């Protein structure tokens with residue numbers, strides 16, 4: 001009856017994710033004070049991370065608990081596609097926010113004259129467009145399938161929903177969906193840690209007006225660096241191992257490959273918790289929870 005002592009932690013984590021992200025969307029949707037530009041991208045994340053809790057985690061939970069896929073050969077690929085999509089759409093939006101805070105911290109004038117709200121919404125959709133094209137289609141077109149006699153065995157089996165992929169895909173799909181966006185995100189997230197350091201460096205002047213607006217605008221930039229940071233810690237392991245197999249299979253235990261995968265799942269619930277650093281958010285979550 002070990003199944004009962006697991007469905008609790010699983011229903012618990014689904015709760016944290018959903019409740020938490022539904023909260024973050026409401027906090028921004030209600031409070032006009034939280035309806036900033038960057039907080040639109042943050043909304044996108046709250047959605048990607050929500051879809052995970054609502055669909056990706058539930059199904060993925062029954063596959064670990066029962067040890068067998070019970071929802072057919074279709075929902076297998078469909079659940080896989082939503083999974084890959086949500087992770088692609090995330091790293092891309094985090095990569096946007098980096099370039100955003102960069103262009104908004106080095107060209108304050110050009111930024112305001114070019115970056116509106118209706119344009120940033122286009123940006124958000126363009127990201128979800130590329131994410132689908134890149135992750136969703138190649139799966140639908142079965143470019144991931146392997147010719148291995150063992151692999152061909154798992155495709156004809158509806159009860160088996162293992163993501164057995166060839167090595168050509170394994171490499172390209174991980175580069176495109178993760179590594180390239182990650183490197184870009186990291187590089188730019190370091191260029192914004194230098195300018196945001198030189199701004200608080202060449203601040204022996206200013207005032208309790210200009211140092212207060214550099215105390216709020218360095219302070220959010222930290223919360224973003226934490227989001228980008230934690231996210232990397234939860235998904236970089238998984239993708240390192242993912243590549244290891246491409247070079248040398250049977251070197252990493254399958255139980256572990258699933259471990260690091262759930263590590264990256266937990267990352268969806270970690271966001272709303274980190275937003276409690278901001279006084280605004282922290283006050284907005286109390287309004288809704290009826291305190």
Ligand SMILES: CC(C)(C)NC[C@H](O)COc1cccc2[nH]c(C#N)c(I)c12
Nearest residue numbers: 080083084087163165169170173174177
């Ligand atoms: C295997 C499964 C149970 C569904 N979990 C997949 C991960 O959530 C996401 O893994 C990825 C995310 C984004 C792009 C990716 N490319 C490849 C490959 N090869 C993977 I694995 C991958």
